[PDB]
Amino acid sequence: GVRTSPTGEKVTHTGQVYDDGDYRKVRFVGRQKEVNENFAIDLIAEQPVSQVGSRVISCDGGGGALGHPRVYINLDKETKTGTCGYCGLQFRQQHH
Amino acid sequence: TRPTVRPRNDVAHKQLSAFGEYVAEILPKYVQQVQVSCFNELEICIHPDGVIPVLTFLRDHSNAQFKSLADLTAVDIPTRQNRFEIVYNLLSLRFNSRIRVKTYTDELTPIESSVPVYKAANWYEREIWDMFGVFFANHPDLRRILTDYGFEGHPFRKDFPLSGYVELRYDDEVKRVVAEPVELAQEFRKFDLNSPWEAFPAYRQPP
Amino acid sequence: TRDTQLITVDEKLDITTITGVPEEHIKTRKARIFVPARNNMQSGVNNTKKWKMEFDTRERWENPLMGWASTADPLSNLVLTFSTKEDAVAFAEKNGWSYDVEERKVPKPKSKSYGANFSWNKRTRVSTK
Amino acid sequence: LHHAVIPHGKGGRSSVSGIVATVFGATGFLGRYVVNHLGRMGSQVIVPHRCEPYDTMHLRPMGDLGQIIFMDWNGRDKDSIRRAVEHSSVVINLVGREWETQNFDFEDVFVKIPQAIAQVSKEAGVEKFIHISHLNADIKSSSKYLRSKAVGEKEVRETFPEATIIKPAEIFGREDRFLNYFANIRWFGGVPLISLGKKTVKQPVYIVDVTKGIINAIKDPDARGKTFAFVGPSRYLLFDLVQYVFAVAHRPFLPYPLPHFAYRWIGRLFEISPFEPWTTRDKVERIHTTDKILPHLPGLEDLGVEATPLELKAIEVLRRHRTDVQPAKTIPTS
Amino acid sequence: LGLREIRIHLCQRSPGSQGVRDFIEKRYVELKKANPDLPILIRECSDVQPKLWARYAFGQEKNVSLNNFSADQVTRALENVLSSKA
Amino acid sequence: ASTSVKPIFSRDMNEAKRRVRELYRAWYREVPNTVHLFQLDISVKQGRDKVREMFKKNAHITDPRVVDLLVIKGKMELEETIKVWKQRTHVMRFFHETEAPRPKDFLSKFYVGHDP
Amino acid sequence: ILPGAAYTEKSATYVNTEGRAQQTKVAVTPPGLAREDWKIIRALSEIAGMTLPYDTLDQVRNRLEEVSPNLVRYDDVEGANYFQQASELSKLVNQQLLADPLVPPQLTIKDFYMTDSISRASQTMAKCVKAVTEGAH
Ligand SMILES: NC(=O)C1=CN([C@@H]2O[C@H](COP(=O)(O)OP(=O)(O)OC[C@H]3O[C@@H](n4cnc5c(N)ncnc54)[C@H](OP(=O)(O)O)[C@@H]3O)[C@@H](O)[C@H]2O)C=CC1
Ligand SMILES: [Zn+2]
């Protein structure tokens, strides 16, 4: 999700971009500004919400010992999904 | 037994305790304190006047024969009025034992050079002078050993900044390496790591 | 009863000329001798035992290349630990730094009573437990 | 770092001075001293270069990481000049050459290129512009070097009215072509001179004084749209000056006169080579031109620079020519 | 161009400031009704040598030490400042 | 007592001052040799001025022991110069030829930065 | 407009409501070209030809001592006295109370979060004012 500023410089996923009158743009003349194209905030939104049949689900990021510390997510609130604090995956409780 | 704990050696703790009293009795004029750590290391704390008498006795006496000077260094404790602690680590190949001798001095009081006793102290004393600024009297050749020529200050003092006061650089205008006040592109990040909870109650100091 | 021949020197101890410190960092600085305040996020009181000496904060600016914090102050990271207020003032005086001494702040002894939570008439009664 | 750039730090290598400078011709004699002073205080220096990158290596140590930036440019390509000044707040032109080439003559290096830089700088939004000229610049002389300077100085003053023209005399230093020029006349005989060095008065100026003057013109506000004449403290006769050079260099001095037309011919002989000529017709004229006295122009003293006497810092230049010296007789102010 | 403000310094329970403390208790109220527009700044502080500061026009200041004075000597100094300006 | 302390070399200022002069004479006589061996671009007079200035900055010292150290260090500096352990770069670090003067007036400081 | 340093950027003296003088310490330096407030006035005086007699912070604090000796007794409460004399002068010039009830400027918490330049510029205080007016959600 790389947006381009009016001057033409790419905006990084952290929102960084040099203003129009900033002299530091001179470092990119004859070179390029390295911007990662895969915005994490956009890719984790594409993941589907998981429907589970319990009030508390546990996420370890997938992969067992290769994932992240195992945490338990409470799904009693029906107005929102339960998001994992480490990896961003979302969970919902089936019809309750 | 207990697989994760260091086993005690009470036999070696007894022996080093006995030899510490032995040394304290034979040289009462200088010895100020004798202690044995929980891992069996004997320390003799002496008045600085006893550096040559105490070291000579330990080197030559038939029951000491501490004929190797393993190391000789200094520790800077600014809170003491005698901020420097001169430490001698000696080895006895005859009795297969080690002893540590400690004394003290300040920024101005000289210490006696132990070169006459151990020749190995020639460079160790120069390093102490260079890095701490402790003057050793009657040293055959006392001068900086580790620091740059003309270096100002004694880096190992606790009040000397880690990055110093000057940095070198080549200046094309004068065609030589020059020294200028230090400016770091990234300042050293001081971390405060100490836990606010006491770790070892056995070492608690009185209020 | 020392055999070594001593001499009389009646002047305040001063070592400013034999420490190698630039004169700019002896006369313009401002030491602060204090007992650190407890970190209010924790109840541990083991960092409030010793006296500290630190120096006055100076400029830190953004490094043009990377945005890092730069500094031209050699004493920015220097902190010394002292057992008592006096031996901390003694160190400052012989090094020539002007200093401020802040008296130790010890918590007042509190009168605590669990039974007061269930008082018959007084206002200390608690509504929830 | 919003309105211009805010200075930060102690004025050292890793500080920020707020000066974003483009230095054209930074790879020459006066250029390396200008970059050294800009980069020594923490300035963002942009160095367009026409040469091999190998020839720009003595500039990399002159600034902290990222402070010296190198770009390719062509004197006849307006776009390249635009890319090198669009981000700058000050532009310094040190482009020059002591001889003409098959591709670049004096009308290019001293008139067309300086005017190209001035024009692109003006429309790029650059506020300060420093141009280097010659003390003896005027369209009346036999030196096509000096005639071009006068034309270029007027064109710079017209394209960029707020420019700052510097007019130095013969600059001496380690890499100069002035004191080192009066030390390479030993493999042919004596020291040829128009007349015998008489009727030629020179006022050489130290390289660091010129460099320190250019730096103070960037910082000084009351130097926009002004012309300066950087000259040394003392005046000398070319005979006495050259005699001093050989005495300091411990070389036998055997001055003999040579006709003005005769010196031109040997100048022709030495300019046929494809390399940097040892001497040329124009070089002989400029050395034998008398340094003008323009008391109506502020000089080094108007920028806080004390001119360095030639006797104090002549040994550092002539030390390498050697295999208690009397100072040269000087013209009194009167 | 004369007196602009008066400042009196003294301690709370130091013997050397006894005279000045006497002056404030009884004389000061009389001195203040006669000079309604003159700021007289009484400022007390522990273990301070008592003094009287008078600030005339254009920032000139003169100080006289009221150390171990009696209430009579103190009121004498006030006149030397209120009357003999500078 | 408290004020009794070991001497380094000198038991009073008068003996210490003797060692200061003996050091000054040794330094004063090596500037011409130092300016020659190291091929310095400075004159002998300004080399001797720097020696004088170094002896002048710490001229208020009244402790005999501090004087001894200043002389002990001064002799070490002289030995490094005479033996040519130093190089041209070390001898010239007394002159600070590359750092611009730091103005000492209040207004000049106020414009450049926050330092006093 | 002369930019000055905020309270987190200067070693400055303040007196609380009980006469206790305390001093701040420099946490960060003031931004951009801002300078310490008392130095902006020392600089102005010299350019005006009325140079003040103090060039350093300690000297400026010596001047504070000459005007009110309690302003350099940090973290100390100096008792004030002479309530009787203050009361005597309080009734020499009579004045009439108005007939409008005493209304404080701050009645509910919505009036507490923004009261000065620093709080009015805070984006967190603004969210607190919105929270106590609009509520949750
Ligand atoms: N040095 C002196 O004695 C005097 C100097 N001046 C003037 O100062 C200016 C610079 O002086 P100085 O440094 O000593 O001269 P130098 O010969 O040492 O350097 C000249 C600079 O200009 C560049 N240059 C020449 N032609 C071109 C071109 N077509 N395109 C791009 N760059 C070119 C050169 O680049 P490259 O090296 O890659 O070829 C070089 O960097 C000159 O204009 C001179 O007239 C004034 C009075 C006396
Ligand atoms: Zn997860």
Swiss-Prot record, chain D:
Xref: SUPFAM superfamilies: NAD(P)-binding Rossmann-fold domains
Gene3D superfamilies, per the entry: NAD(P)-binding Rossmann-like Domain (3.40.50.720)
Keywords noted in UniProt: Acetylation, Electron transport, FAD, Flavoprotein, Mitochondrion, Respiratory chain, Transit peptide, Transport
PTM: Acetylated on lysine residues. BLOC1S1 is required for acetylation.
GO BP term, pick one: ubiquinone biosynthetic process
Cofactor note: Binds 1 FAD per subunit.
GO CC annotation, single: respiratory chain complex I
Pfam families tied to this protein: Epimerase
Signal listed as a keyword: no
Single GO term (MF): NADH dehydrogenase activity
Location of N6-acetyllysine modifications: 154
Top-rank taxon: Eukaryota
Flavoprotein among keywords: yes
Subcellular location: Mitochondrion matrix
Modified residues (N6-succinyllysine): 140
Cofactor(s) for this UniProt protein: FAD
Family: Belongs to the complex I NDUFA9 subunit family.
Annotated PANTHER family: NADH DEHYDROGENASE [UBIQUINONE] 1 ALPHA SUBCOMPLEX SUBUNIT 9, MITOCHONDRIAL, NADH-UBIQUINONE OXIDOREDUCTASE 39 KDA SUBUNIT-RELATED
Complex and partners: Complex I is composed of 45 different subunits. This a component of the hydrophobic protein fraction. Interacts with BLOC1S1. Interacts with SLC2A4. Interacts with CLOCK. Interacts with RAB5IF.
Function: Accessory subunit of the mitochondrial membrane respiratory chain NADH dehydrogenase (Complex I), that is believed not to be involved in catalysis. Complex I functions in the transfer of electrons from NADH to the respiratory chain. The immediate electron acceptor for the enzyme is believed to be ubiquinone.
Identification of the protein by name: NADH dehydrogenase [ubiquinone] 1 alpha subcomplex subunit 9, mitochondrial
Species per Swiss-Prot/TrEMBL record: Bos taurus (Bovine)
Gene: NDUFA9
Swiss-Prot record, chain E:
Cysteines joined through disulfide linkages: 11-45
A Pfam cross-reference name: L51_S25_CI-B8
Subunit relationships: Complex I is composed of 45 different subunits.
Predominant location: mitochondrion
Encoding gene per record: NDUFA2
Family membership: Belongs to the complex I NDUFA2 subunit family.
Role noted for this protein: Accessory subunit of the mitochondrial membrane respiratory chain NADH dehydrogenase (Complex I), that is believed not to be involved in catalysis. Complex I functions in the transfer of electrons from NADH to the respiratory chain. The immediate electron acceptor for the enzyme is believed to be ubiquinone.
InterPro entries: NADH_Ub_cplx-1_asu_su-2, Ribosomal_mL43/mS25/NADH_DH, Thioredoxin-like_sf
Organism: Bos taurus (Bovine)
The name this protein goes by in its record: NADH dehydrogenase [ubiquinone] 1 alpha subcomplex subunit 2
Entry's localization field: Mitochondrion inner membrane
Keywords assigned: Acetylation, Disulfide bond, Electron transport, Membrane, Mitochondrion, Mitochondrion inner membrane, Respiratory chain, Transport
Residues bearing the modification N6-succinyllysine: 51
Topological relation to the membrane, as annotated: Peripheral membrane protein
The keyword Membrane is annotated on this UniProt entry: yes
Gene Ontology cellular component list: mitochondrial inner membrane; mitochondrial membrane; mitochondrion; respiratory chain complex I
Curated annotation (Swiss-Prot), chain F:
Function: Accessory subunit of the mitochondrial membrane respiratory chain NADH dehydrogenase (Complex I), that is believed to be not involved in catalysis. Required for proper complex I assembly. Complex I functions in the transfer of electrons from NADH to the respiratory chain. The immediate electron acceptor for the enzyme is believed to be ubiquinone.
Organism: Bos taurus
Subunit field text: Mammalian complex I is composed of 45 different subunits.
GO cellular component: mitochondrial inner membrane; mitochondrion; respiratory chain complex I
Keywords (A to Z) from UniProt: Acetylation, Electron transport, Membrane, Mitochondrion, Mitochondrion inner membrane, Respiratory chain, Transport
Name the record gives this protein: NADH dehydrogenase [ubiquinone] 1 alpha subcomplex subunit 6
Membrane topology annotation: Peripheral membrane protein
Pfam families per the UniProt record, alphabetical: Complex1_LYR_2
Curated annotation (Swiss-Prot), chain G:
Domain of life the protein comes from: Eukaryota
Residues bearing PTM N6-acetyllysine: 127
Localization, UniProt: Mitochondrion inner membrane
Family: Belongs to the complex I 75 kDa subunit family.
Subunit field text: Core subunit of respiratory chain NADH dehydrogenase (Complex I) which is composed of 45 different subunits. This is the largest subunit of complex I and it is a component of the iron-sulfur (IP) fragment of the enzyme. Complex I associates with ubiquinol-cytochrome reductase complex (Complex III) to form supercomplexes. Interacts with MDM2 and AKAP1.
Function per UniProt: Core subunit of the mitochondrial membrane respiratory chain NADH dehydrogenase (Complex I) which catalyzes electron transfer from NADH through the respiratory chain, using ubiquinone as an electron acceptor. Essential for catalysing the entry and efficient transfer of electrons within complex I. Plays a key role in the assembly and stability of complex I and participates in the association of complex I with ubiquinol-cytochrome reductase complex (Complex III) to form supercomplexes.
Protein name: NADH-ubiquinone oxidoreductase 75 kDa subunit, mitochondrial
Parent sequence residues shown: 583 to 719 of 727
